[PDB]
Amino acid sequence: AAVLQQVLERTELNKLPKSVQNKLEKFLADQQSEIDGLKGRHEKFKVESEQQYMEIEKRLSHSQERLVNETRECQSLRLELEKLNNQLKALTEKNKELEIAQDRNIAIQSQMTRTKEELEAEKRDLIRTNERLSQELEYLT
Amino acid sequence: AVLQQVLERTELNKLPKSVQNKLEKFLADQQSEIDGLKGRHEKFKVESEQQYMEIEKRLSHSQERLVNETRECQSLRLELEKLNNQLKALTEKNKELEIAQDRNIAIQSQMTRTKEELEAEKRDLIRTNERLSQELEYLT
């Protein structure tokens, strides 16, 4: 599993001191490990990124759909508001002309009460005159 | 270049030139591969974050507009509720006005009766008072 026997031959590898071989293999090993470590790290990031991207793309999809519905509800409300505002305007007009009618009746009834009291007063005067003439008639008989 | 990072000066000069070239080439190939992986990862990271950043703005923009639309919709129901209560209360009031109007006419026809009746009593009062006057004349 040695990296050094790959690069050099058996004749020139054996010409290297133990110490020297140990240093080279140590460093060549570390380079092999970093390569695999980088490739390992890249995949962990890759799956994490793609995973996060899917889920936030999901949220957008839901948001879009919710907006479409809300916009549709707004428009439905605006229509029934417009229809009811016309309903109300006509109901106000009908009301304020019923107000007019009420005041007319209140005026009429108040006036006819005024006349009643006039007929009342005039009757009292004729009655008072009546009894006075009645009494003057009792002297002359 | 690279053979200096592995071995000290006095022991690396003890290696033949062909051996030095063979190690040096290999060491460089691996470092070239490492720096390649690092470059690869850095650019992928930068693309990955930008792609996420963009759609995040797209969501943020969409959620803001969902908030705007929800408020308007809520306020629209609000307007429609107050308006429905106006209608309801006005129908009730109009109903009562109609009933009062009908009742008022009944009263007016009643007051007319009392008027005619009083005028008839007054007319008779004038008749008896004239009769009484001419009778006084006769007696004095």
Side-chain angles (χ1 to χ4, degrees):
Chain A
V3 193
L4 209 47
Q5 75 203 347
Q6 309 175 19
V7 300
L8 302 171
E9 306 154 21
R10 275 291 177 175
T11 59
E12 47 192 16
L13 172 50
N14 293 333
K15 288 174 183 294
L16 300 174
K18 210 199 310 180
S19 69
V20 173
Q21 294 179 28
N22 289 344
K23 288 178 181 183
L24 291 165
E25 290 260 48
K26 169 61 175 168
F27 189 94
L28 270 62
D30 290 6
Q31 278 188 334
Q32 300 280 358
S33 305
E34 186 175 2
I35 285 165
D36 289 5
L38 286 167
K39 288 155 92 156
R41 271 267 173 195
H42 177 71
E43 252 292 310
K44 303 302 291 181
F45 187 91
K46 192 176 181 298
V47 296
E48 173 77 298
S49 178
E50 293 170 336
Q51 175 196 88
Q52 284 177 301
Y53 188 78
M54 284 193 264
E55 294 188 19
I56 183 154
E57 208 168 36
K58 227 103 160 187
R59 287 156 65 201
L60 173 59
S61 190
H62 185 54
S63 176
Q64 296 282 30
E65 197 168 20
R66 289 240 293 171
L67 173 57
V68 170
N69 298 10
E70 205 71 13
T71 305
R72 192 156 46 82
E73 178 84 354
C74 267
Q75 284 155 358
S76 292
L77 280 169
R78 284 190 203 95
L79 181 60
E80 38 187 345
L81 274 153
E82 189 166 305
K83 291 184 179 169
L84 286 192
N85 274 314
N86 287 337
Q87 271 205 32
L88 185 73
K89 204 207 306 165
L91 206 66
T92 50
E93 283 279 60
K94 161 168 298 190
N95 175 261
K96 273 73 184 76
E97 274 154 16
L98 284 168
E99 299 293 335
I100 284 172
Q102 179 176 52
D103 300 327
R104 258 206 162 101
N105 286 329
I106 300 307
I108 289 182
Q109 279 158 228
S110 179
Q111 181 48 234
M112 300 182 295
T113 288
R114 177 73 181 191
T115 299
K116 177 178 103 288
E117 299 164 342
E118 295 306 317
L119 272 52
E120 215 83 54
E122 293 161 11
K123 163 194 292 201
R124 285 197 295 274
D125 297 316
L126 290 173
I127 282 177
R128 203 164 56 243
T129 306
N130 182 263
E131 43 190 56
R132 172 172 56 78
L133 296 182
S134 300
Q135 173 61 50
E136 279 162 2
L137 253 189
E138 295 198 319
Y139 294 135
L140 304 180
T141 65
Chain B
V2 190
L3 261 186
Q4 293 169 330
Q5 314 160 208
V6 301
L7 306 162
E8 309 305 287
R9 186 196 309 134
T10 69
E11 57 184 0
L12 74 94
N13 283 27
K14 203 167 189 181
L15 316 188
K17 203 67 190 76
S18 74
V19 170
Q20 287 185 33
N21 292 335
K22 282 170 184 186
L23 298 176
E24 181 64 36
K25 176 203 170 60
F26 184 76
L27 283 159
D29 273 25
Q30 294 209 123
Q31 180 137 104
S32 177
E33 186 167 6
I34 289 181
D35 301 325
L37 283 165
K38 276 182 182 172
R40 174 210 197 191
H41 180 48
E42 231 302 316
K43 288 186 75 282
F44 185 100
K45 170 182 159 235
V46 170
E47 247 291 305
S48 162
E49 290 177 359
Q50 283 291 81
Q51 293 293 311
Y52 190 95
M53 181 171 146
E54 177 216 79
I55 52 88
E56 192 176 53
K57 247 173 250 182
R58 295 188 314 127
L59 176 62
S60 179
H61 265 272
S62 168
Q63 278 299 133
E64 183 196 319
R65 299 179 66 214
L66 178 58
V67 169
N68 294 354
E69 202 76 338
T70 309
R71 268 230 184 175
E72 260 296 318
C73 173
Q74 285 166 341
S75 168
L76 277 174
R77 263 253 153 55
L78 172 65
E79 293 177 349
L80 178 63
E81 186 83 310
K82 183 256 191 60
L83 181 48
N84 264 326
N85 292 335
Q86 250 171 297
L87 267 178
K88 176 180 183 191
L90 243 184
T91 61
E92 295 179 3
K93 184 162 178 293
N94 283 10
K95 276 170 167 296
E96 216 51 42
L97 283 181
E98 294 183 339
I99 270 55
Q101 182 170 10
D102 190 68
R103 164 186 161 85
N104 279 327
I105 268 60
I107 291 164
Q108 294 182 21
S109 53
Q110 185 200 295
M111 291 181 173
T112 290
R113 253 172 272 129
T114 69
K115 176 179 185 171
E116 300 165 328
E117 172 185 333
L118 285 166
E119 280 192 60
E121 293 168 27
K122 170 182 299 170
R123 178 211 301 142
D124 297 331
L125 259 48
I126 287 186
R127 164 175 160 72
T128 170
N129 283 349
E130 263 147 37
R131 159 65 157 146
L132 288 172
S133 296
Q134 85 156 31
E135 201 59 36
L136 277 171
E137 174 75 15
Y138 178 81
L139 297 183
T140 183

